């Protein structure tokens, strides 16, 4: 009866507390995720423990099919939850149950204040100024299977010279657009993380599509649709809107 | 292979009577975004489908008792398998019908003419010079007399005083409203930018006061949800159903 919750460490959905003493359980992280998580169980009448995913990873296929990640925890059952900023994608969906979106966002650009870039095409048409994105991520995944002309040359720019535009992780991305002249194509909810706490950075255009983060339980879970019932609950109640308020306000950049 | 029986209702520009010479049976009747999905979701599940419009031309609220009517009540009678319309996702319809994943994303905003002194929601919940409403037992009414929070419960008020004076039948009726008195129209903000693109004197006011989509609905335990929702996500990652929107939306320019 009590759930098993996969989750994975990221600012500002879960992250470990600062703690002058060790911390044990639950107790050990803070964030959106754990807030929502708060509330979910709240409303569901359910007690989670919260499980860091072991490798450290959100979910992607290999070229022999196999998956990995909080995606690979649900489908092998060894949690019932999955509560993370995990992108709502048609792959996964096919092998795991999504809840309907706790929140919705998009691809976006993420780049320097003060410059003559206003969209992905300025950025396709050129190639002084180099772009990429997270290896392995939804983001990249979606350049890497897309049809549209743009995004296939895009695609095809970030491939080039053995992927040495895409970065590891999206520190590394935000370092290198902090330090050189990289674009770094990105989450817009992470955008608008950053942007408020680094006043160097900024959108570039708007959003390039539309999706959302989703709970993730494995295929035939009974918690989806309450999960799901649960989010919109919280959404009309307007709860969803007081944590990101709560978790987005930084520094205040103008 | 049988043919599925998808309900759906007459609303500019997802469902609307084609023009013709001549008389049209069956699908052929029909065109817009919701019409064009239904070829999109055929073409990649390969099911084929059968339109019929809502008997009750509704989308599906409680009364008293408890009991539904519209698209809603269709789909709970089993007396049809899909709903393909602009159908808001709502705590109350999600546990009597089980939807897809959202095909189009939204929210309540603000249907005004330009050139104001209003920004926001609070700058109506601050006045009565300026009448404001919406659309009567839609959703949209549902969120503000549902609502906890202070200026939501104002404004609430503001639209039941007086019989619902405030209330309009539907957004037609609404957007006329507008157009001729000083009127603002509580509505989403899909159908905003519907009318803001053949209105100029028209505008959005504030952003989305909450966030919602609209889910094709299926009956509860119907085979057909997780095959849609999948279908859904092909479609937005292709930008198909972005190029729909455009398609249906853009209505030339205001200068
Ligand atoms: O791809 C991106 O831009 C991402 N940044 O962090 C993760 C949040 N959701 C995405 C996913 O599930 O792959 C990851
Ligand atoms: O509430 C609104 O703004 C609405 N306008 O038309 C309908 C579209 N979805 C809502 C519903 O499902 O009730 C209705
Ligand atoms: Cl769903
Ligand atoms: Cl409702």
Same mark, same amino acid.
């Given at each position: 009866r009590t759930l098993i919750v996969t989750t994975i460490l990221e600012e500002p959905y879960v992250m470990y507390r600062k703690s002058d003493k060790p911390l044990y359980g639950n107790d050990r992280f803070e964030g959106y995720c754990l807030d929502l998580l708060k509330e979910l169980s709240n409303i569901l009448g359910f007690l989670y423990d919260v499980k860091l995913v072991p490798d450290g990873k959100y979910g992607a296929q290999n070229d022999k099919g196999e998956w990995n990640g909080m995606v690979k925890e649900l489908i092998d059952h060894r949690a019932d939850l999955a509560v993370a900023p995990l992108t709502i994608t048609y792959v996964r969906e096919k092998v795991i149950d999504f809840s309907k979106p706790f929140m919705t966002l998009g691809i976006s650009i993420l780049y320097r204040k003060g410059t003559p870039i206003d969209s992905a095409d300025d950025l396709a048409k050129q190639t002084k100024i180099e772009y990429g994105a997270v290896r392995d991520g939804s983001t990249m995944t979606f350049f890497k299977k897309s049809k549209i002309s743009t995004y296939e040359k895009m695609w095809?720019?970030?491939? =080039?010279?053995? *992927? =040495?535009? /895409?970065?590891?992780? &999206?520190?590394?991305?935000? *370092?290198?657009? /902090?330090?050189?002249? $990289?674009? +770094?194509?990105?989450? &817009?909810? =992470?955008?608008?993380?950053?942007?408020?706490?680094?006043?160097?950075?900024? *959108?570039?255009?708007? /959003?390039?599509? =539309?999706?959302? $983060? %989703?709970?993730?339980?494995?295929?035939? &879970?009974?918690? #989806?649709?309450?999960?799901?019932?649960?989010? /919109?609950?919280? *959404?009309?109640?307007?709860? +969803?809107?007081?944590?990101?308020?709560?978790?987005? #306000? %930084?520094?205040?950049?103008?």
């Open positions: 095809a720019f970030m491939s =080039s010279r053995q *992927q =040495s535009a /895409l970065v590891k992780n &999206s520190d590394e991305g935000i *370092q290198r657009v /902090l330090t050189t002249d $990289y674009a +770094l194509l990105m989450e &817009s909810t =992470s955008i608008e993380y950053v942007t408020q706490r680094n006043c160097n950075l900024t *959108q570039i255009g708007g /959003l390039i599509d =539309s999706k959302g $983060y %989703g709970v993730g339980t494995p295929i035939g &879970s009974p918690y #989806r649709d309450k999960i799901t019932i649960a989010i /919109l609950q919280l *959404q009309e109640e307007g709860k +969803l809107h007081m944590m990101k308020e709560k978790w987005w #306000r %930084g520094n205040g950049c103008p």
